[PDB]
Amino acid sequence: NTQTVLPFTGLNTPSGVAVDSAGTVYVTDHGNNRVVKLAAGSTNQVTLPFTGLNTPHGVAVDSAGTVYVTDHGNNRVVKLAAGSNTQTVLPFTGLNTPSGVAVDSAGTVYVTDHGNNRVVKLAAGSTNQVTLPFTGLNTPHGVAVDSAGTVYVTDHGNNRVVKLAAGSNTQTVLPFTGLNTPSGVAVDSAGTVYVTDHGNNRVVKLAAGSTNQVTLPFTGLNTPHGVAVDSAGTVYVTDHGNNRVVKLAA
Q1: CATH homologous superfamily of domain 1-250?
Q2: Of residues 147, 148, 143, 233, the one with CA closest to residue 196
C-alpha cells in the first residue's frame, strides 16, 4: 500500500478529519478558522458555511450528513445540517478547550472536554449533557463511538487509549504500546481501533481483541492529528505539521 495526498488547498495546522458514507472528506482547517470538505474524486474543496469559529478542533458527520465541529477556542460545539445556511450551537455546558467530537447512529453527540479531563454526551434534542464514567483522564483528545455504542477516548496526557462499553461503568485500557501524545482515534465496523500516535509521527491500529498493534505504512508524517476510516477501510489522516491530508487504502 502506498499513500496518496488528497487535493485540499491552503490548509493551515489542520486538525480533525471525518469521512462520510459517500466518501466526502471533511477537515477542520484549524489555522484558518474554517471547515472544508472534498467530494470523492474532486480536486476542489468547498468551505462549509460555519461562522465565528475560533481555533476549531474536531469534526464529525452523521448518517444524515450533518456536520459537527468542536469550536475549541469558544468552548462550544456547533452543527450544520446538510445543505443548511446557518449553524446552531449545541447546548453543552461548562466545556473547556474541547477537542474531539463523535456522533452515533442515534444522533447522540460525544465531546472530549479536554480542559476538564472528561468526556460528555448529549442525546439528540436534549439540553442536558451527561458525563461518561471514565476515570483518571489527563488532557484527553480524540473520541470515537462504534456501532455498539462503545466509546473510545485518546487519553493523550497518559499516552493511552481507553474504552467504555455502552451502559458500562468500568473503563478498560486498550493494549497499545509506545504511544506518545496520541491524538485522533477512529473505529471501523469490524472493531479495529486506529490511533494517530502524534508524538511518534505514525498511525497505529489494533484488531478487536488483539494485544499487538500494527503500524500503518504512511510515510513522512509530521505531528499528525486526526484519523478517520471509511466503509472500505481506507484510512485518512490529517498530517497537521505538513498542512495536508493523506490517505491509505486497506
Answers
A1: TolB, C-terminal domain (2.120.10.30)
A2: 143
To one decimal, the resolution in angstroms is 1.1
Residue 86: all three cell numbers together: 446557518
Name the residue among 17, 13, 38, 8 with its Cα closest to residue 229. 17
Q: Which residues of 125-146 are buried (b: 16+ CB within 10 A; e: fewer)?
A: eeeebeebebeebebbbbbbbb
Closest CA to 31 of 76, 68, 61, 73: 73
Q: Give the closest residue to 7 by CA, choosing from 60, 56, 55, 46.
A: 46
Q: Counting every residue, how long is the chain? A: 250
Distance, CA of 40 to CA of 43 (rounded, Å) = 9
In sequence order, the 6+-apart residues with CB closer than 8 A to the CB of 98 are 57, 58, 70, 72, 75, 76, 77, 92, 111, 112, 113, 114, 115
